[PDB]
Amino acid sequence: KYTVITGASSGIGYETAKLLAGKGKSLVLVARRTSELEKLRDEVKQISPDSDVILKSVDLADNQNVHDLYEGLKELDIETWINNAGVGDFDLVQDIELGKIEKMLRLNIEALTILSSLFVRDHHDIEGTTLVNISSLGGYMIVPNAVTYCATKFYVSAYTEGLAQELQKGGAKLRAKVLAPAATETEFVDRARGEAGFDYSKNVKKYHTAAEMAGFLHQLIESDAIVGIVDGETYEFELRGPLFNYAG
Amino acid sequence: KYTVITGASSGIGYETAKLLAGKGKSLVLVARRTSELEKLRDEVKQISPDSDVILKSVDLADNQNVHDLYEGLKELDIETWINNAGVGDFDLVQDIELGKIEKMLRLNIEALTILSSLFVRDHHDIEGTTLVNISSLGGYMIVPNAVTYCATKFYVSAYTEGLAQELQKGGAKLRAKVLAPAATETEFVDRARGEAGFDYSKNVKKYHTAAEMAGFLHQLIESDAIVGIVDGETYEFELRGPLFNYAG
Ligand SMILES: NC(=O)c1ccc[n+]([C@@H]2O[C@H](COP(=O)([O-])OP(=O)(O)OC[C@H]3O[C@@H](n4cnc5c(N)ncnc54)[C@H](OP(=O)(O)O)[C@@H]3O)[C@@H](O)[C@H]2O)c1
Ligand SMILES: NC(=O)c1ccc[n+]([C@@H]2O[C@H](COP(=O)([O-])OP(=O)(O)OC[C@H]3O[C@@H](n4cnc5c(N)ncnc54)[C@H](OP(=O)(O)O)[C@@H]3O)[C@@H](O)[C@H]2O)c1
């Protein structure tokens, strides 16, 4: 029985793999950097010798890549699916690189939608399955100079909040949860601005570590809440219900 | 000086074209059905003989099609650009057809974002320019049995509210606005559920006509408001500022 983590090679996804390793889970680790994946597998195996680990070097910004990934995993007994892979961009709309933004839409929205839909299709009446989508506090609150990114996270928030409440109204066994982290110390900002070495310690007053966020992720799965969100003012992690208006 | 209307071959975008023709506007009308576009052009020319009308039979669910479209109109004086083309789907996530949902993302989110981005890049400091993105009350309110579509309208809402406030803080001359219609008598229902014939008169208790929505759209342009949103209870058209939290 497997937990699937896209974007496992660094950051939130990486620390989540090490946490579920310590809980003895078997994992499917997806990302492009095979070198990083094989590195994380070794740590998983050292943490948890009897945990089986499958790697998938896959660029999820391509739509058939996404379909092929899920088709390759149907042989498997998946209890948890985590759409963690995701990139930002810090730029005015007038200055964006259309190709980077397009890649972002395809990763942040499409891959997550395709994978959520296929998983929902196949696991909606299977007891004990969970679907976790990673959004951001920026999916509930627009941040200046990250308009296009925030909009992809509002999509993930509204998508997953609606899907969660759809499954509840339908008595589905599958559970669907959305995580909304705040400043988390990952490679997200370096990747977003295109240059490495941004120092959270020196530049950001409030932020969680990736290992902390992996724990909040684990709390969310182990709970009845649809939303696990970091409050922007207190920086507390709160398990709670949907934030967006629902017509049901 | 031209107003670009995507999804002009029916519904809101069509009635808008006629309304603007009655104002003497020149029009770029984009859609797939050349049949419906030519017919509209005849009607526009009868309304307004000296209005120039350019037709563009384009499928905007293809990202290269979207790019080609903008590049073909870079030789025009565009004052207003209206991202109106969009489709819905009524279905549980577990039942969606992956292809229709994917095209919906490509149309509702990507095309709108690509055309929004290029227009902003080229027009932000051109006096008297306006960008209008057509969301829905479903972009501020999740609706059961339409989770994915709502999600795409939440994206359109957050993106355009973000962009609008971005341009304001920067002293742009370009104005960005979002229209959030409620039940609007168009082909939208038929296209979502894949068969023709849905009767608003007999099935929907509250709804605007497509001509009414064209009027709210026009009043939105003739306003200093970022959001024009129909109230779901009273069905009043309200011109107001953003609805989502902004961190600026
Ligand atoms: N960090 C924060 O402050 C923060 C705040 C709110 C939300 N988030 C959300 O956190 C999630 C995790 O990101 P992170 O903060 O941990 O950042 P990160 O350290 O940059 O990790 C991003 C992950 O996504 C993978 N990825 C990126 N593009 C990919 C692609 N095209 N195909 C496949 N995998 C791809 C990366 O691996 P490869 O490079 O190997 O492909 C990596 O494993 C994201 O969804 C992000 O939006 C983060
Ligand atoms: N009607 C409502 O209840 C309601 C409420 C809120 C929001 N809205 C929004 O209103 C907007 C306009 O739709 P409508 O309600 O007027 O419905 P509609 O009558 O179906 O019009 C949609 C338009 O989009 C065009 N279109 C669809 N797919 C396209 C594609 N792939 N490429 C290019 N053009 C495409 C259609 O023309 P072709 O098929 O000829 O290409 C048509 O002109 C949409 O954004 C919709 O979400 C509608």
CSV table of all heavy atoms in Angstrom, one decimal, chain A residues 136-164:
chain,number,residue,atom,x,y,z
A,136,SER,N,-1.9,27.1,-1.2
A,136,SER,CA,-1.1,28.1,-0.5
A,136,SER,C,-2.0,29.1,0.2
A,136,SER,O,-3.2,29.2,-0.2
A,136,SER,CB,-0.2,28.8,-1.4
A,136,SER,OG,0.3,30.1,-0.9
A,137,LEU,N,-1.5,29.7,1.2
A,137,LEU,CA,-2.2,30.9,1.7
A,137,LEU,C,-2.5,31.9,0.6
A,137,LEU,O,-3.5,32.6,0.6
A,137,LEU,CB,-1.5,31.6,2.9
A,137,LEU,CG,-2.0,32.8,3.6
A,137,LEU,CD1,-3.4,32.4,4.2
A,137,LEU,CD2,-1.1,33.3,4.7
A,138,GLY,N,-1.6,31.9,-0.4
A,138,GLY,CA,-1.8,32.7,-1.6
A,138,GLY,C,-2.9,32.2,-2.5
A,138,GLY,O,-3.3,33.0,-3.4
A,139,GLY,N,-3.5,31.1,-2.2
A,139,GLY,CA,-4.8,30.6,-2.8
A,139,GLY,C,-6.0,31.1,-2.1
A,139,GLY,O,-7.1,30.8,-2.5
A,140,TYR,N,-5.9,31.9,-1.0
A,140,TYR,CA,-7.0,32.5,-0.3
A,140,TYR,C,-6.8,34.0,-0.1
A,140,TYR,O,-7.7,34.7,0.3
A,140,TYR,CB,-7.2,31.9,1.1
A,140,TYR,CG,-7.6,30.4,1.0
A,140,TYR,CD1,-6.7,29.4,1.2
A,140,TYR,CD2,-9.0,30.1,0.8
A,140,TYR,CE1,-7.1,28.0,1.2
A,140,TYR,CE2,-9.4,28.7,0.8
A,140,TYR,CZ,-8.4,27.7,1.0
A,140,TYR,OH,-8.8,26.4,1.0
A,141,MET,N,-5.7,34.5,-0.6
A,141,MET,CA,-5.3,35.9,-0.4
A,141,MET,C,-4.3,36.3,-1.4
A,141,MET,O,-3.2,35.7,-1.4
A,141,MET,CB,-4.8,36.1,1.0
A,141,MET,CG,-4.4,37.5,1.4
A,141,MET,SD,-3.3,37.4,2.9
A,141,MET,CE,-2.1,36.2,2.2
A,142,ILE,N,-4.7,37.2,-2.4
A,142,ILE,CA,-3.8,37.5,-3.5
A,142,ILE,C,-2.6,38.3,-2.9
A,142,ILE,O,-2.8,39.3,-2.1
A,142,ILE,CB,-4.6,38.4,-4.5
A,142,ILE,CG1,-5.7,37.5,-5.1
A,142,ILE,CG2,-3.6,38.9,-5.6
A,142,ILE,CD1,-6.7,38.3,-6.0
A,143,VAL,N,-1.4,38.0,-3.4
A,143,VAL,CA,-0.2,38.6,-2.9
A,143,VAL,C,0.3,39.4,-4.1
A,143,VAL,O,0.5,38.9,-5.2
A,143,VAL,CB,0.9,37.5,-2.6
A,143,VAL,CG1,2.2,38.2,-2.3
A,143,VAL,CG2,0.4,36.6,-1.4
A,144,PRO,N,0.6,40.7,-3.9
A,144,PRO,CA,1.2,41.5,-5.0
A,144,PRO,C,2.5,40.9,-5.5
A,144,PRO,O,3.3,40.3,-4.8
A,144,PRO,CB,1.5,42.9,-4.3
A,144,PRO,CG,0.6,42.9,-3.1
A,144,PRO,CD,0.5,41.5,-2.6
A,145,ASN,N,2.6,41.0,-6.8
A,145,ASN,CA,3.7,40.5,-7.6
A,145,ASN,C,3.7,39.0,-7.7
A,145,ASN,O,4.8,38.5,-8.2
A,145,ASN,CB,5.1,41.0,-7.1
A,145,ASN,CG,6.1,41.2,-8.2
A,145,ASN,OD1,6.3,42.3,-8.8
A,145,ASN,ND2,6.8,40.1,-8.4
A,146,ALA,N,2.6,38.4,-7.4
A,146,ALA,CA,2.5,36.9,-7.7
A,146,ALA,C,1.0,36.7,-8.1
A,146,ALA,O,0.4,35.7,-7.6
A,146,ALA,CB,2.9,36.1,-6.5
A,147,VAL,N,0.5,37.5,-9.0
A,147,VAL,CA,-0.9,37.4,-9.3
A,147,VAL,C,-1.2,36.1,-10.1
A,147,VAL,O,-2.2,35.4,-9.7
A,147,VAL,CB,-1.3,38.6,-10.2
A,147,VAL,CG1,-2.6,38.5,-10.8
A,147,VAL,CG2,-1.2,39.9,-9.4
A,148,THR,N,-0.4,35.7,-11.0
A,148,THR,CA,-0.7,34.5,-11.8
A,148,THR,C,-0.5,33.3,-11.0
A,148,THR,O,-1.3,32.4,-11.0
A,148,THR,CB,0.2,34.5,-13.1
A,148,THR,OG1,0.2,35.7,-13.8
A,148,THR,CG2,-0.3,33.3,-14.0
A,149,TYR,N,0.5,33.2,-10.1
A,149,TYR,CA,0.7,32.1,-9.2
A,149,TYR,C,-0.5,32.0,-8.3
A,149,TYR,O,-1.2,31.0,-8.2
A,149,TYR,CB,2.0,32.2,-8.5
A,149,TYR,CG,2.1,31.3,-7.3
A,149,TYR,CD1,2.4,30.0,-7.5
A,149,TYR,CD2,2.0,31.8,-6.0
A,149,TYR,CE1,2.5,29.1,-6.4
A,149,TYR,CE2,2.1,30.9,-4.9
A,149,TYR,CZ,2.4,29.6,-5.1
A,149,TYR,OH,2.5,28.7,-4.0
A,150,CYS,N,-0.8,33.1,-7.5
A,150,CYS,CA,-2.0,33.1,-6.6
A,150,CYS,C,-3.2,32.6,-7.3
A,150,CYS,O,-4.0,31.8,-6.7
A,150,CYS,CB,-2.2,34.5,-6.1
A,150,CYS,SG,-0.9,34.9,-4.9
A,151,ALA,N,-3.4,33.0,-8.5
A,151,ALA,CA,-4.6,32.5,-9.2
A,151,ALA,C,-4.6,31.0,-9.5
A,151,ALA,O,-5.6,30.4,-9.4
A,151,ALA,CB,-4.7,33.3,-10.6
A,152,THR,N,-3.4,30.4,-9.7
A,152,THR,CA,-3.4,29.0,-9.8
A,152,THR,C,-3.7,28.4,-8.4
A,152,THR,O,-4.2,27.3,-8.3
A,152,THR,CB,-2.1,28.4,-10.3
A,152,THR,OG1,-1.0,28.6,-9.4
A,152,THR,CG2,-1.7,29.1,-11.6
A,153,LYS,N,-3.3,29.1,-7.3
A,153,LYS,CA,-3.6,28.5,-6.0
A,153,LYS,C,-5.1,28.7,-5.6
A,153,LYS,O,-5.6,27.8,-4.9
A,153,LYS,CB,-2.6,29.0,-5.0
A,153,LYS,CG,-1.2,28.5,-5.2
A,153,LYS,CD,-1.2,27.1,-5.6
A,153,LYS,CE,0.2,26.5,-5.4
A,153,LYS,NZ,0.2,25.0,-5.5
A,154,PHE,N,-5.7,29.8,-6.0
A,154,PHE,CA,-7.1,30.0,-5.8
A,154,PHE,C,-7.9,28.9,-6.6
A,154,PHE,O,-8.9,28.4,-6.1
A,154,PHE,CB,-7.6,31.3,-6.3
A,154,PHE,CG,-7.6,32.4,-5.3
A,154,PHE,CD1,-6.4,33.0,-4.9
A,154,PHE,CD2,-8.8,32.8,-4.8
A,154,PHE,CE1,-6.5,34.0,-4.0
A,154,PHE,CE2,-8.8,33.8,-3.8
A,154,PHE,CZ,-7.7,34.4,-3.4
A,155,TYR,N,-7.4,28.5,-7.7
A,155,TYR,CA,-8.0,27.3,-8.5
A,155,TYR,C,-7.8,26.1,-7.6
A,155,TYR,O,-8.8,25.3,-7.5
A,155,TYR,CB,-7.3,27.1,-9.8
A,155,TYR,CG,-7.8,25.9,-10.5
A,155,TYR,CD1,-8.7,25.9,-11.5
A,155,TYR,CD2,-7.3,24.6,-10.1
A,155,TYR,CE1,-9.2,24.7,-12.1
A,155,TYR,CE2,-7.8,23.4,-10.7
A,155,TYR,CZ,-8.7,23.5,-11.7
A,155,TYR,OH,-9.2,22.4,-12.3
A,156,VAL,N,-6.7,25.8,-7.1
A,156,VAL,CA,-6.5,24.6,-6.3
A,156,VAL,C,-7.4,24.6,-5.1
A,156,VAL,O,-8.0,23.6,-4.7
A,156,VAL,CB,-5.0,24.3,-6.0
A,156,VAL,CG1,-4.9,23.2,-5.1
A,156,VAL,CG2,-4.2,24.1,-7.3
A,157,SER,N,-7.4,25.8,-4.4
A,157,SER,CA,-8.3,25.9,-3.2
A,157,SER,C,-9.7,25.7,-3.6
A,157,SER,O,-10.4,24.8,-3.0
A,157,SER,CB,-8.1,27.3,-2.6
A,157,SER,OG,-6.9,27.3,-1.9
A,158,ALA,N,-10.3,26.4,-4.6
A,158,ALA,CA,-11.7,26.2,-4.9
A,158,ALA,C,-11.9,24.8,-5.5
A,158,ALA,O,-13.0,24.3,-5.2
A,158,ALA,CB,-12.1,27.3,-5.9
A,159,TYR,N,-11.0,24.3,-6.3
A,159,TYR,CA,-11.2,23.0,-6.8
A,159,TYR,C,-11.3,22.0,-5.6
A,159,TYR,O,-12.4,21.3,-5.6
A,159,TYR,CB,-10.0,22.6,-7.7
A,159,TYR,CG,-10.1,21.2,-8.3
A,159,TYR,CD1,-11.0,21.0,-9.4
A,159,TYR,CD2,-9.4,20.1,-7.8
A,159,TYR,CE1,-11.2,19.8,-10.0
A,159,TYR,CE2,-9.6,18.9,-8.4
A,159,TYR,CZ,-10.4,18.7,-9.5
A,159,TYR,OH,-10.6,17.5,-10.0
A,160,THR,N,-10.4,21.9,-4.7
A,160,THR,CA,-10.3,20.9,-3.7
A,160,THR,C,-11.4,21.1,-2.6
A,160,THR,O,-11.9,20.2,-2.1
A,160,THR,CB,-8.9,20.9,-3.1
A,160,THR,OG1,-7.9,20.8,-4.1
A,160,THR,CG2,-8.7,19.8,-2.1
A,161,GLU,N,-11.7,22.4,-2.3
A,161,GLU,CA,-12.8,22.6,-1.4
A,161,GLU,C,-14.1,22.1,-2.0
A,161,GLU,O,-15.0,21.5,-1.3
A,161,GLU,CB,-12.9,24.1,-1.1
A,161,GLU,CG,-12.0,24.6,0.1
A,161,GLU,CD,-12.3,26.0,0.6
A,161,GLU,OE1,-13.3,26.6,0.2
A,161,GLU,OE2,-11.5,26.5,1.4
A,162,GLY,N,-14.4,22.3,-3.3
A,162,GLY,CA,-15.6,21.8,-3.9
A,162,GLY,C,-15.6,20.3,-4.0
A,162,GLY,O,-16.6,19.7,-3.7
A,163,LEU,N,-14.5,19.7,-4.4
A,163,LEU,CA,-14.3,18.3,-4.5
A,163,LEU,C,-14.5,17.6,-3.1
A,163,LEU,O,-15.3,16.6,-3.0
A,163,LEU,CB,-13.0,17.9,-5.1
A,163,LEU,CG,-12.5,16.5,-5.0
A,163,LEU,CD1,-13.6,15.6,-5.7
A,163,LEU,CD2,-11.1,16.3,-5.6
A,164,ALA,N,-13.9,18.2,-2.1
A,164,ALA,CA,-14.1,17.7,-0.8
A,164,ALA,C,-15.6,17.6,-0.4
A,164,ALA,O,-16.1,16.6,0.1
A,164,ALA,CB,-13.3,18.5,0.2
